[PDB]
Scaffold this active site. Structure first.
Site, mmCIF file in Angstrom:
data_model
loop_
_atom_site.group_PDB
_atom_site.id
_atom_site.type_symbol
_atom_site.label_atom_id
_atom_site.label_comp_id
_atom_site.label_asym_id
_atom_site.label_seq_id
_atom_site.Cartn_x
_atom_site.Cartn_y
_atom_site.Cartn_z
ATOM 1 N N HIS A 41 0.851 -1.191 0.000
ATOM 2 C CA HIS A 41 0.000 0.000 0.000
ATOM 3 C C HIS A 41 0.895 1.252 0.000
ATOM 4 O O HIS A 41 1.623 1.499 0.969
ATOM 5 C CB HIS A 41 -0.966 -0.038 1.199
ATOM 6 C CG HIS A 41 -1.886 1.149 1.276
ATOM 7 N ND1 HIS A 41 -2.838 1.409 0.314
ATOM 8 C CD2 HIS A 41 -2.024 2.117 2.218
ATOM 9 C CE1 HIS A 41 -3.504 2.516 0.648
ATOM 10 N NE2 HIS A 41 -3.029 2.970 1.800
ATOM 11 N N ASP A 82 1.042 5.259 -0.321
ATOM 12 C CA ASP A 82 0.315 6.525 -0.279
ATOM 13 C C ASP A 82 1.046 7.605 -1.058
ATOM 14 O O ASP A 82 2.202 7.886 -0.739
ATOM 15 C CB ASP A 82 0.187 6.980 1.160
ATOM 16 C CG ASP A 82 -0.594 5.995 1.982
ATOM 17 O OD1 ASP A 82 -1.820 5.788 1.744
ATOM 18 O OD2 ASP A 82 0.038 5.358 2.853
ATOM 19 N N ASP A 125 1.646 -1.396 4.467
ATOM 20 C CA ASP A 125 2.096 -0.089 3.955
ATOM 21 C C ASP A 125 3.538 -0.192 3.477
ATOM 22 O O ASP A 125 4.410 -0.657 4.216
ATOM 23 C CB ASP A 125 2.034 0.974 5.063
ATOM 24 C CG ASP A 125 0.630 1.344 5.463
ATOM 25 O OD1 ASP A 125 -0.332 0.691 4.991
ATOM 26 O OD2 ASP A 125 0.509 2.345 6.210
ATOM 27 N N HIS A 137 -6.626 9.594 -0.547
ATOM 28 C CA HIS A 137 -7.277 9.519 0.753
ATOM 29 C C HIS A 137 -6.471 10.138 1.918
ATOM 30 O O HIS A 137 -6.968 10.102 3.049
ATOM 31 C CB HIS A 137 -7.704 8.072 1.054
ATOM 32 C CG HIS A 137 -6.556 7.086 1.106
ATOM 33 N ND1 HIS A 137 -6.132 6.380 -0.006
ATOM 34 C CD2 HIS A 137 -5.725 6.708 2.125
ATOM 35 C CE1 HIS A 137 -5.107 5.599 0.333
ATOM 36 N NE2 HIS A 137 -4.830 5.777 1.620
ATOM 37 N N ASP A 157 -8.011 1.331 1.819
ATOM 38 C CA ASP A 157 -7.739 2.353 2.839
ATOM 39 C C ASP A 157 -8.663 3.583 2.947
ATOM 40 O O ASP A 157 -8.575 4.250 3.958
ATOM 41 C CB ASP A 157 -6.264 2.786 2.794
ATOM 42 C CG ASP A 157 -5.699 3.232 4.155
ATOM 43 O OD1 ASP A 157 -6.157 2.694 5.203
ATOM 44 O OD2 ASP A 157 -4.768 4.091 4.195
HETATM 45 C C1 LIG Z 1 -0.083 2.342 15.197
HETATM 46 C C2 LIG Z 1 -1.269 3.287 15.389
HETATM 47 C C3 LIG Z 1 -0.789 4.698 15.737
HETATM 48 C C4 LIG Z 1 -2.135 2.837 16.570
HETATM 49 C C5 LIG Z 1 -2.062 3.338 14.093
HETATM 50 C C6 LIG Z 1 -3.392 2.921 14.023
HETATM 51 C C7 LIG Z 1 -4.103 2.970 12.822
HETATM 52 C C8 LIG Z 1 -3.482 3.457 11.666
HETATM 53 C C9 LIG Z 1 -4.258 3.531 10.385
HETATM 54 O O1 LIG Z 1 -5.394 3.061 10.362
HETATM 55 C C10 LIG Z 1 -3.620 4.258 9.204
HETATM 56 C C11 LIG Z 1 -4.444 4.161 7.920
HETATM 57 C C12 LIG Z 1 -5.746 4.987 7.968
HETATM 58 C C13 LIG Z 1 -5.494 6.501 7.955
HETATM 59 C C14 LIG Z 1 -4.656 6.904 6.731
HETATM 60 O O2 LIG Z 1 -4.330 8.288 6.832
HETATM 61 C C15 LIG Z 1 -3.383 6.074 6.676
HETATM 62 C C16 LIG Z 1 -2.506 6.201 5.431
HETATM 63 O O3 LIG Z 1 -3.275 6.371 4.210
HETATM 64 C C17 LIG Z 1 -1.745 4.868 5.399
HETATM 65 O O4 LIG Z 1 -1.843 4.252 4.098
HETATM 66 C C18 LIG Z 1 -2.364 3.964 6.480
HETATM 67 N N1 LIG Z 1 -3.685 4.609 6.719
HETATM 68 C C19 LIG Z 1 -2.154 3.878 11.726
HETATM 69 C C20 LIG Z 1 -1.447 3.824 12.932
HETATM 70 ZN ZN LIG Z 2 -3.368 4.793 2.790
#
Ligand SMILES: CC(C)(C)c1ccc(C(=O)C[C@H]2CC[C@@H](O)[C@@H]3[C@H](O)[C@H](O)CN23)cc1
Ligand SMILES: [Zn+2]
Ligand SMILES: *[C@@H]1O[C@H](CO)[C@@H](O)[C@H](O)[C@H]1NC(C)=O
Length: 1016
Positions: A61, A63, A312, A442, A175
């Protein structure tokens, strides 16, 4: 012929509004599957004659900006991922990989040497590397306009067709923060057969899993027949990461992420690490893994199972490719050779999964349910609803809509001609399309990127706006200059754009004053463009250096005009008041422009020594205690003063509006005889919790219902004119303005939340309307969906995206608020509407961003407010999940999103100037739009091709007689048509060769694309 989108309630197995009404949303501990239950399966379900087929699909993934910029991630991560994917797939013929983000892939591919380009084409051609979706990005689905979702999809897929000779028919959206039916709508009209989604409310995953309804035929909410349906797979678990994709127990699945043994700096938070697969452990490891797979398979209807394998920015290092591949190969060899498992497992792609599912379906082994509705508002756990990002970084949300329109106008204006390569038209348009497309990501439009990444997106969009301006003004000059005189310098600015609402008064001093004077320049040509395919009138304003200016059309016919002062609001840090100052050397001239369909109209502004016959002057009244003088130079009417008081205004024959002494609307009276209907604007504030989870860029976690903003005794400015009147008030954090031009008012808020930490500012409307718990909001500017407020859910769950409008109604009355920018909103009580203006949050909300939202900047939000009687309208039945705008509300939305463009001629004299372009263009029915006009060929092509996207909305029938309008045939807009074809929305596949070279108009709620070919 056309389906009735109003009167036939579709019969679907799952209707999301109905499901929401029934569901209890209990958040109980399900065990190892924290938000589910302990899955059980019959070991005898699979046998020699009925095996479980498992596709392990490697992915990464990536971004296009989030915690790093696009270019930073490309240099640090993505270029290495793609380089190593190329090497590893080349060398390992059974290994597979899917790729979604074409912005990155195009950057990478263009930088490759030819030998490597050829190697890359070969692993795509042979099916090892497969593109999924193929858009420039994986877009947000909440805030994005459908036009820009299509733009970015087209940008990526056009690149893929040209360079890779493939067009994906399966979509991958793992995502975005909740999911919209606008996606299957566009995808199904763009050749797609399948799509996959992930981020849906945990309670929805549980409910659908229990019923094996995670795979479904997703149709539009109004679609009775089902022709819009697209097969959709919803993933069942909390994340797309490896711990949440092998099966229900992440403690087990984490042991099958072979990047987590230590040397890569990763570990398993469930405290059991992966172990290298060996001959001594493979039987045991396989028994644990197959057990997870068989549990996951219980949630679905076929014997074909999808196992994503990624996270990611994965698959970056060679050692990582090896560690995942070799360990999975050992597992597959064991599992597949041991009959007792009754499993055949392999690396696969997304399309391979879907092909096998549909083979199983055709073999009669499964039937799939039908579904309509959306998947907002998402919560990933507990009460953590992701409604904050409907508002976060609202400056850039507004910028998105401005650039949306400038891209459309630039592509349309320049499409009329073929251009020499030296004009750099295709170059500038590609740049503009790509920067706008990138922002659909996103983490772009959502307002969920780090501060420096937001700045990068902004800079890119600014460059895109400049590219659009250049193309637009070159096009205007060509379209309106006598052909034998036209002598272009492709670097020169013949016109400058004048935009009254971006960045906006009080945001940037960006507009040019038209400088006239007896000793310098007597007059100035201006030109308006109308991108909509119907004749349109609209008031337009320009800044001029004298109040004594009059307007003529190019036939020298006088045009009635109004001059008003230029008012700017200042936060006086000495007196501690917010009050307006007037210019003594710049003035606003306002007049009605009338512009052909998809056309241009020229006017002339001329100075005189004294008041011109056809120009009037607004009165101005400043309401405050302790006033001081307000001189206005040559402006002929002296400013008047008074103590705060209620006031009423009426422009033309339009509504009469009443305002409180604080300058806020209190009532609307539609006609002379009619009632003064209560409609009250109010500003309130939400705060943040002092214990537990904190609001941040994603999450809205208010500390209770909003509290009123303390207004004090604000300064109110009333400007009263024949053409335009307005009431403006300087409130804490908001200069609020109600503008009247004879129809529904325009509302503008200049929002500057300043240093108010942990505050969200909301604008609320309070009415009498007996709406109960029902309200309507739009999805992506495309359709209006019925919402039901649910008191069983927390406040933030009842917030929805407001990408372009919202309404409430009862049997007799409707109030619709149209927006020029996506924001979050709700109806928290009967008769109310509310929409968030900005939010400033000191804390991170634990979704990886690693910062609060403290980078607010002044933004000018724009709206139209439409109060209407609807007792005579033919509306959907009480069970129908959709709603529809009236003509007035739809036109009001168009006035915000696609206003007239204004051009000021730069030089002193325009030799060969013409008065109009497009007077012969058909004026199409009001519900039809030419959403896109794009020339598809460069000037070297013998056969020129022009593409059109046509969208017909659906407007309510309310008893206004239809007047005859003209049929719009886009294929005859350019001369010498030789062929007309219906195509997919991306223009990439011809679907129908059209009789008589005539492009038929589309049905209500349908969107079609056509390409006309021209022999000269
Ligand atoms: C480790 C902790 C801090 C608890 C954490 C928890 C959830 C997430 C996401 O869901 C991130 C998801 C969901 C939110 C989005 O902004 C991001 C980016 O697009 C990236 O691709 C991953 N996405 C991340 C970190
Ligand atoms: Zn993402
Ligand atoms: C592109 O794909 C099509 C469909 O498989 C094929 O017929 C065509 O030859 C391919 N073009 C090239 C250059 O390989």
């Amino acid at each position: 012929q056309c389906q009735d989108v109003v009167q036939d309630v579709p019969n679907v197995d799952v209707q999301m509004l109905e499901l929401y009404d029934r569901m209890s949303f209990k958040d109980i501990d399900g065990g190892v599957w924290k938000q589910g239950w302990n899955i059980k399966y019959d070991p005898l379900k699979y046998n020699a004659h009925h095996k479980l087929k498992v596709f392990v699909v490697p992915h990464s993934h990536n971004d296009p900006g989030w915690i790093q910029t696009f270019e930073e991630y490309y240099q640090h991560d993505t270029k290495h991922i793609l380089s190593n994917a190329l090497r590893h797939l080349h060398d390992n013929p059974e290994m597979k990989f899917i790729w979604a983000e074409i912005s990155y892939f195009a950057r990478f591919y263009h930088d490759l040497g030819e030998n490597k380009k050829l190697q890359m084409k070969s692993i795509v051609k042979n099916g090892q590397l497969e593109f999924v979706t193929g858009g420039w990005v994986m877009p947000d689905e909440a805030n994005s306009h459908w036009r820009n979702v299509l733009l970015q999809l087209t940008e990526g897929q056009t690149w893929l067709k040209q360079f890779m000779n493939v067009t994906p028919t399966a979509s991958w959206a793992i995502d975005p923060f909740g999911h919209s039916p606008t996606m299957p709508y566009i995808l199904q009209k763009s050749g797609f057969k399948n799509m996959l989604i992930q981020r849906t409310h945990y309670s929805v995953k549980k409910e659908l899993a229990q019923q094996r309804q995670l795979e479904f035929l997703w149709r539009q909410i109004w679609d009775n027949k089902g022709d819009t349906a697209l097969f959709t797979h919803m993933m069942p678990f909390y994340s797309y990461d490896i711990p949440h994709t092998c099966g229900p127990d992440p403690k087990v699945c984490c042991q099958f992420d072979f990047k987590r043994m230590g040397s890569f700096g990763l570990s398993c938070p469930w405290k059991v690490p992966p172990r290298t697969i060996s001959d001594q452990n493979v039987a045991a490891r396989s028994d644990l893994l197959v057990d997870q797979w068989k549990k996951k398979a219980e949630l679905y209807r076929t014997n074909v199972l999808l196992i994503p394998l990624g996270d990611d920015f994965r698959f970056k290092q060679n050692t990582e490719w090896d560690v995942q591949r070799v360990n999975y190969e050992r597992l597959f060899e064991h599992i597949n050779s041991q009959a007792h498992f009754n499993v055949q497992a392999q690396f696969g792609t997304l399309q391979e999964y879907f092909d096998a599912v549909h083979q199983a379906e055709r073999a009669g082994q499964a039937e799939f349910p039908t579904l309509s509705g959306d998947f907002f508002t998402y919560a990933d756990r507990s009460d953590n609803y992701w409604s904050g990002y409907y508002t976060s970084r609202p400056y850039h949300k507004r910028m998105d809509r401005v650039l949306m329109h400038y891209v459309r106008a630039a592509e349309m204006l320049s499409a009329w001609h073929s251009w020499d390569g030296m004009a750099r038209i295709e170059e500038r348009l590609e740049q503009a399309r790509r920067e706008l497309s990138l922002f659909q990501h996103h983490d772009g439009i959502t307002g969920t990127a780090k501060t420096h990444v937001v700045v990068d997106y902004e800079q890119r969009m600014q460059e895109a706006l400049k590219a659009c301006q250049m193309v637009m003004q070159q096009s205007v000059y060509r379209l309106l200059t006598k052909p034998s005189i036209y002598s272009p310098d492709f670097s020169f600015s013949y016109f400058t754009l004048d935009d009254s609402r971006w960045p906006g008064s009080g945001v940037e001093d960006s507009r040019t004053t038209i400088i006239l004077g007896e000793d310098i320049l007597p007059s100035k040509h201006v030109v308006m463009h109308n991108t909509l395919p119907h004749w349109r009138e609209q008031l337009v304003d320009f800044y001029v250096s004298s109040p004594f200016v009059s307007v003529t059309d190019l036939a020298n016919n006088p045009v009635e005009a109004q001059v008003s002062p230029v008012w700017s609001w200042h936060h006086d840090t000495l007196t501690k008041t917010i009050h307006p100052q007037g210019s003594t050397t710049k003035y606003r001239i306002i007049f009605k422009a009338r512009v052909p369909p998809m056309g241009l109209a020229t006017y002339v502004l001329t100075i005189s020594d004294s008041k011109p016959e056809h120009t009037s002057y607004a009165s101005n009244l400043l309401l405050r205690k302790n006033p001081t003088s307000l001189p206005l130079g040559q402006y002929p009417e002296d400013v008047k003063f008074g103590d705060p008081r209620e006031i009423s205004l009426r422009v033309g024959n339009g509504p009469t509006l009443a305002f409180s002494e604080q300058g806020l609307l209190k009532s609307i009276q539609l006609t002379q005889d009619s009632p003064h209907v209560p409609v009250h604007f109010k500003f309130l504030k939400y705060g943040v919790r002092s214990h537990g989870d904190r609001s941040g860029a994603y999450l809205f976690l208010p500390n209770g219902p909003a509290s009123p903003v303390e207004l004090g005794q604000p300064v109110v400015l009333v400007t009263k004119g024949k053409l335009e009147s307005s009431v403006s008030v300087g409130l804490p954090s908001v200069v609020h303005q109600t503008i009247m031009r004879g129809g529904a008012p325009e509302i503008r808020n200049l929002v500057d939340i300043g240093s108010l930490d942990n505050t969200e500012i909301v604008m609320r409307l309070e009415t009498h309307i007996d709406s109960g718990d029902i309200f309507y909001t739009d999805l992506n500017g495309l359709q209006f969906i019925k919402r039901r407020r649910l008191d069983k859910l927390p406040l933030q769950a009842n917030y929805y995206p407001i990408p372009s409008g919202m309404f409430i109604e009862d049997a007799n009355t409707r109030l619709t608020l149209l927006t020029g920018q996506p924001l979050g909103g709700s109806s928290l009580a009967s008769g109310e509407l509310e929409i968030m203006q900005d939010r400033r949050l000191a804390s991170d909300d634990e979704r990886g961003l690693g910062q609060g939202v403290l980078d607010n900047k002044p933004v000018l939000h724009i709206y139209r407010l439409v109060l209407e009687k609807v007792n005579n309208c033919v509306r959907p039945s009480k069970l129908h999940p959709a709603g529809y705008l009236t003509s007035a509300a739809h036109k009001a939305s168009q006035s915000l999103l696609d206003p007239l463009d204004k051009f000021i001629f730069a030089e002193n004299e325009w030799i060969g100037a013409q008065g109009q372009f497009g007077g012969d263009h058909p004026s199409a029915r009001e519900d039809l739009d030419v959403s896109v006009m794009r020339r598809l060929t460069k000037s070297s092509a013998k056969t020129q091709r022009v593409g059109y996207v046509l969208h017909r909305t659906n407007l309510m029938q309310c008893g206004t007689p239809e007047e005859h309008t003209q049929k719009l045939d886009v294929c005859h807009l350019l001369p010498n048509v030789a062929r007309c074809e219906r195509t997919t929305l991306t223009f990439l596949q011809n679907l129908e060769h059209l009789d008589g070279m005539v492009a038929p108009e589309v049905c209500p709620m349908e969107t079609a694309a056509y390409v006309s070919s021209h022999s000269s």
